[PDB]
């Protein structure tokens, strides 16, 4: 898939302003170097995961100052996909670890609900119209399925859905509005798929004068251990993305993906 | 199969009478099967559904309850089982047995049934999630549903469908002898769930007597609550009590509300950019 790469590739064909900037400041080259260094790491011991994090830090240090200063709102398109593409690298080896061919490992809309909204009494009997609500998540590990409804009139109406085992939101900074929105989604997500792990990953924290809502979210990671308001202050050094957190997150995901979950009895 | 007259109450008597020798003795000695047969025959024989015909169905209902409920109450008691509550259910089956031509389609469900509430996923493991993800349909028992039935199939990468029968209601009605606090709260909770699952389902709570100790006020998602006899369940206790009959005009009001609902176009995209508004 390559979420971040795909955004760059399309902006470079389509957006004259942004393609100019990409060439002049060497974004494509830096991106290529990040991908090539990331995709060649085969193992997932602690050291390998810390190598992925170093390449991630390097890429962000190279490219985020360009996104921030050289693009307008041409760049609240570019920056957020970096973490998403990162997770695709981190979890690109799960097929051989767990012995199954996992179709979803990228941003996707995970199933929330099925409800029925027939046009009329005829329709309700013959072929009831329905809605699958799904929620876009920054990163999902899951399966895809087909959902078919059939009435008396014999034809099946089918919808493709994604069922997550893991879903991760990825943000630069976590503020009040977003964290509340995440806690509401967690509630829906746990009714729909009780065995889905739900993580909110941010680099910076920005809850100011306010108290975080820790609803049904399994973990919140603040990768740089710093407050958002430090960013505009005089001579500011951003902490790197902490490799120990990503190592912790990796282990928790993998532990979850290898376990049993549900059982008619045991 | 298709069947709008399943005789829920008749079926209860018939099974009690085959299985419970004590109860079947009581049935014969006090003429319950005869009174029941008379109720069914008078109900089945009313062909129209104008106001007067609906009042006639209610009179037959009143008569049958007057005949049989004092027997259930005093001669059987806890062996009354599902006996007394099914009368109102069988009643609604009579009331709605002829809707097929008015509405233009044969309605498959018109009986107590579990209407679909939600679909959620509970895979056994990562293998199962990809191949064939296990799931749960939550559904709610209602005393009477007018609705359709559908098949829900989920399929993973390993091809084969896991199928479940569901019922999708257009109307769902709870039927009780008396309405108390616990049941009303439980009904209000179900109404919230029921409106997310099937927003175009009409939801009614019908009882004969009211038993709300508290007059504390709660808005709810129940479309109508009918107290058929307009009395309190505290009068029933008292020395020398005459029960008010089931009021025919309320049942007439309920019938008309159901029929208006079943005739309407519920979801109409083209009828929304026409008007301006989505409702009235
Ligand atoms: Br591939
Ligand atoms: Br595949
Ligand atoms: Br919902
Ligand atoms: Br018949
Ligand atoms: Br009672
Ligand atoms: Br629900």
Author numbering:
A (entry chain B): 9 to 274
B (entry chain A): 4 to 283
According to the publication:
BbvCI, a Type IIT restriction endonuclease, recognizes and cleaves the seven base pair sequence 5′-CCTCAGC-3′, generating 3-base, 5′-overhangs. BbvCI is composed of two protein subunits, each containing one catalytic site. Either site can be inactivated by mutation resulting in enzyme variants that nick DNA in a strand-specific manner. Earlier mutagenesis of these residues confirmed their catalytic nature and demonstrated that the site in the R1 subunit cleaves the bottom strand of the target site, while the site in the R2 subunit cleaves the top strand.
However, after derivatization with heavy atom compounds ‘I3C’ or tantalum bromide, the space group was converted to C2221, with only two subunits (one dimer) in the asymmetric unit. We initially calculated MIR phases, built an initial structure, and conducted refinements using datasets corresponding to the latter (heavy-atom) space group, and then subsequently determined the final, higher resolution structure of the native (non-derivatized) protein in the original C222 space group via molecular replacement and phase extension. Initial attempts to model the density as a heterodimer of R1 and R2 subunits resulted in high values for the refinement R-factors, particularly RFree. In contrast, modeling the electron density as a homodimer comprising two copies of the R2 subunit resulted in satisfactory values for Rwork and Rfree (0.189/0.249, respectively), excellent correlation of the model to experimental electron density, and significantly improved geometric quality. Similar attempts to model and refine a homodimer of R1 subunits, instead, further degraded the model's performance and refinement statistics. Crystallization of the R2 subunit under such conditions revealed an elongated dimer with the two catalytic sites located on opposite sides. The first 115, and final 110, residues of each protein chain form a single protein domain of mixed alpha-beta topology built around the alpha-beta-alpha core common to PD-(D/E)XK REases. An intervening four-stranded, anti-parallel beta-sheet (residues 116–175) protrudes from this core. This interacts in a domain-swapped manner with its symmetry-mate in the opposing subunit, to form a dimer interface corresponding to an elongated beta-sheet. The molecule is saddle-shaped due to deep concave surfaces at the dimer interface, and there is no obvious region of contiguous positive surface charge that might accommodate a DNA duplex of seven or more base pairs.
